[PDB]
Design a protein around this ligand. Sequence first.
Ligand SMILES: Cc1cc2nc3c(=O)[nH]c(=O)nc-3n(C[C@H](O)[C@H](O)[C@H](O)COP(=O)(O)OP(=O)(O)OC[C@H]3O[C@@H](n4cnc5c(N)ncnc54)[C@H](O)[C@@H]3O)c2cc1C
Ligand SMILES: Cc1cc2nc3c(=O)[nH]c(=O)nc-3n(C[C@H](O)[C@H](O)[C@H](O)COP(=O)(O)OP(=O)(O)OC[C@H]3O[C@@H](n4cnc5c(N)ncnc54)[C@H](O)[C@@H]3O)c2cc1C
Ligand SMILES: [Cl-]
Ligand SMILES: [Cl-]
Ligand SMILES: [Cl-]
Ligand SMILES: [Cl-]
Ligand code: NA
Ligand code: NA
Lengths: 487, 490
Amino acid sequence: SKAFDLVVIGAGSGGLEAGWNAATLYGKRVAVVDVQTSHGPPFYAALGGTCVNVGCVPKKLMVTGAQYMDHLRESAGFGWEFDGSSVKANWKKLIAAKNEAVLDINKSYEGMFNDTEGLDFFLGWGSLESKNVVVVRETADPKSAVKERLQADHILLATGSWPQMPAIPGIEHCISSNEAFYLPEPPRRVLTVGGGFISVEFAGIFNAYKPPGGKVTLCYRNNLILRGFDETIREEVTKQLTANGIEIMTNENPAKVSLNTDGSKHVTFESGKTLDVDVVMMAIGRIPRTNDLQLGNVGVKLTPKGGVQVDEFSRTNVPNIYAIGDITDRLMLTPVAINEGAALVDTVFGNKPRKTDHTRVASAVFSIPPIGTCGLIEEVAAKEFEKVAVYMSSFTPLMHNISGSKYKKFVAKIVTNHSDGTVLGVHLLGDGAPEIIQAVGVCLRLNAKISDFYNTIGVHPTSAEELCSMRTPSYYYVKGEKMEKLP
Amino acid sequence: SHMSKAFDLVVIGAGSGGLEAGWNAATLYGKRVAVVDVQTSHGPPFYAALGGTCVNVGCVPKKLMVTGAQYMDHLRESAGFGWEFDGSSVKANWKKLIAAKNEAVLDINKSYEGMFNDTEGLDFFLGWGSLESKNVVVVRETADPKSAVKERLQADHILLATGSWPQMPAIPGIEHCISSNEAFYLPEPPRRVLTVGGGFISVEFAGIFNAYKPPGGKVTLCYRNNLILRGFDETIREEVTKQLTANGIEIMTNENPAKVSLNTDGSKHVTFESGKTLDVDVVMMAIGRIPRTNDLQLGNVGVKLTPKGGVQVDEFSRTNVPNIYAIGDITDRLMLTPVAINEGAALVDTVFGNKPRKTDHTRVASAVFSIPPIGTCGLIEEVAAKEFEKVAVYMSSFTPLMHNISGSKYKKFVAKIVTNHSDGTVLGVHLLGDGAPEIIQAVGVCLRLNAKISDFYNTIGVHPTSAEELCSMRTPSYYYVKGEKMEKLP
Ligand SMILES: Cc1cc2nc3c(=O)[nH]c(=O)nc-3n(C[C@H](O)[C@H](O)[C@H](O)COP(=O)(O)OP(=O)(O)OC[C@H]3O[C@@H](n4cnc5c(N)ncnc54)[C@H](O)[C@@H]3O)c2cc1C
Ligand SMILES: Cc1cc2nc3c(=O)[nH]c(=O)nc-3n(C[C@H](O)[C@H](O)[C@H](O)COP(=O)(O)OP(=O)(O)OC[C@H]3O[C@@H](n4cnc5c(N)ncnc54)[C@H](O)[C@@H]3O)c2cc1C
Ligand SMILES: [Cl-]
Ligand SMILES: [Cl-]
Ligand SMILES: [Cl-]
Ligand SMILES: [Cl-]
Ligand code: NA
Ligand code: NA
């Protein structure tokens, strides 16, 4: 048995931040537990968390790889000549370079533990034995061989989320994003199930790397992909995915999946339609990872959705037990889990309580082309503010009339409280959107108004400068109703 | 008819500034406006045309050409992500680039053309504008004041918006050299080229010629002092030098051409002041741009010039003559299109809108489209350090993740924030690497709202991006205390 000031269950974004800050800013004794030290099967997430191993970082590399499909084709407009028939996308080379890059980060975090005093790493499955004891076991079976027992005065739960699998017959024929990262070969025909950013991002990855005669289909059970994003943007990205050869099946949901004699999958939709594919990747949701923690042993309370319930400072119902990051089922983003972990350790080991602000958080979707957003979409703004204005600009950038990708419209929309000009949200679609939106998140912390954008001098020629050129609302919401003139 | 025409405002120069002023005077305030320019569409002999330098031989076509040049990196970098193709078959077709560019520019030319037909009170006159007197602009067939008169335009107010022009140094064999204007029209990409100058135009062109050079080629950039891009962040100056070298560009600093002659094969033989020599197919001089005031006949009305040669103006763009104003590059200040545009809008609001307004020339964001590019806004540290007793510099430099796989590990991203350490106010932000021009725009908005470093640091990052580094810097890398560089406060 071993003592500590902080035991962190889960060496991911939120937990490495919390642990690192405690060991180094406040010189506490920290233990951190995870099930695996390097990425991949069988447990996928590992030292560094979801982001590093099966998340933001490898997805970004693979989206970057998929973008060359457009680049190679678009180069001809600017005079570039080569043998187009010689072009092939080697997925194994992609995956191998991606794995090497992720493994470098893994080795780097191992070195971080070996080099930082008062921060120890424990390999295996952690769970709550009592209010101040964490057990680590050989496997996730609450019953396997104990490896270590750790008493702790404070306990941080930061075990993240896991893909949700619907309970349809044949679900075990489907993969999740976890397995997608390791596919031996690029699927020829693939169905991504879901309308959110993971389904959209992988559909473009697979679309770029599919072999000759490939097809990517994305299905979603409701009418329009990317619920929660700007409505013009959802429509436009739908249109740009279609122009790049992806087939979008809206109002469709798998009812079952079966095995074909050749090893491919036979998907039957609730509507009766059928599709044969090599891979069915479910990306319908991620759920808080709470099962393995034996939370009953101490009474830590859950919300009706399955998140560990927390107050604004991340405290559970049981004193000295905390929860940050995806396990709380709030904003599922890496930097938000990091900010929670830092605010928590500031509150508990330093002294200036700090709470994470969950409004006006900027985020991105690495679709092709990508989306960058911060703050409210207009239909949510229309329910809290009596007068809302929407400034909108949309057009194909001149580089994309030369490249031949004419379908590539840039969209910039600014939503305001029309009573005092306060910017409430900014929504972007087009090359560079994720990069443009970062400093827009700072603007929103400063309560920028539309006149602060419009009075700023443009950087020319950029897409971003569009945000500084809008003076006149394209339309309004008054008391929740959409209209073109103010009444 | 054979009678002069009358206007509230005559603008000489239909470019960035003049078109903004004219359009706004006509459409917002119902003035009667004339705009004069020398050519309706781009290209020789006069290069700039309706739409200005920006549209014809500046921002717009250079960005299309830098975008074309970036495919050289994209093609190469694709291999690290598993793209395979016949490398040996790769050609850069400069003539296709130039054709595509001319066609895009000409489309813009044509759309300005129809704006004039349907805008009531906004008229275009072709030829050369000069001041005959306080209320009469004469338009002539050429820049020579003896050339024939095409029109006389009566004007209550006159706006000088004639922009700037490349400067040519008076060295022997200067006639064998070209400027950026000709560079846009060269029939063939040069095998060997010297770009003379260390400013943005020389650097951006070096990148473009480097991508499109034929098989045995070489781009050399020379600069008379010791480090390119004066006026920019010093770290970024040194790093951009390294990245350009890494891409096969030869940077010769502390070198200056003394003379140029023709070898017997027709190539250019450049001798430097050091006595070093270089043979090239093209010498592009880009040592500076000067205000275009010579053709205006300013002596006729007594408009004063600064020592530097620009039209002297007050904060409201007024000259020493009551109803004659000047904006844009002719005033030899900040030579940027959106600055000319903002000056034009402010001037018109002031004169005809009764809502006085002056352009703010501080904290203007701007970009260099070098490969890799720069985005910058506000003070560089050594300027800040002369004005503020305590200055903190936050600095981060990293290889973005993609370049761990691409092959281009030399592509370091640099992000610097310079602050007044007494109260945390951001004084300057300086960025080098892919996306920097796009990231920096909203930074301009932050600086105009007096952001502090903690406004940055408390903002949650968008992950994974390069921009998020701006919102993860909490501890100075170093300081200046009463002008003195030091890694810690005393
Ligand atoms: C495909 C995909 C793409 C994504 N892209 C982005 C993006 O672009 N930008 C963004 O901001 N966010 C992105 N995310 C979300 C981001 O990955 C998460 O929000 C983030 O990782 C949450 O961090 P966390 O600390 O809550 O959990 P995690 O980082 O998931 O860490 C949990 C850790 O706990 C370990 N663990 C679980 N149970 C136990 C146990 N009982 N004992 C010991 N260890 C355990 C796991 O092995 C894991 O390493 C993406 C997610 C996915 C799935
Ligand atoms: C190569 C290059 C690249 C550039 N890149 C950028 C960039 O990326 N971003 C940026 O912001 N700025 C850029 N600039 C600068 C930008 O082009 C100028 O700051 C801007 O055009 C200034 O606008 P203006 O209205 O002062 O003058 P202009 O746009 O130059 O307009 C002046 C007009 O007056 C006309 N004219 C001149 N004399 C007369 C006369 N006597 N009678 C009638 N008409 C006349 C000319 O034909 C011209 O059309 C670049 C410039 C160059 C040369
Ligand atoms: Cl769905
Ligand atoms: Cl819907
Ligand atoms: Cl060619
Ligand atoms: Cl020089
Ligand atoms: Na350690
Ligand atoms: Na931050």
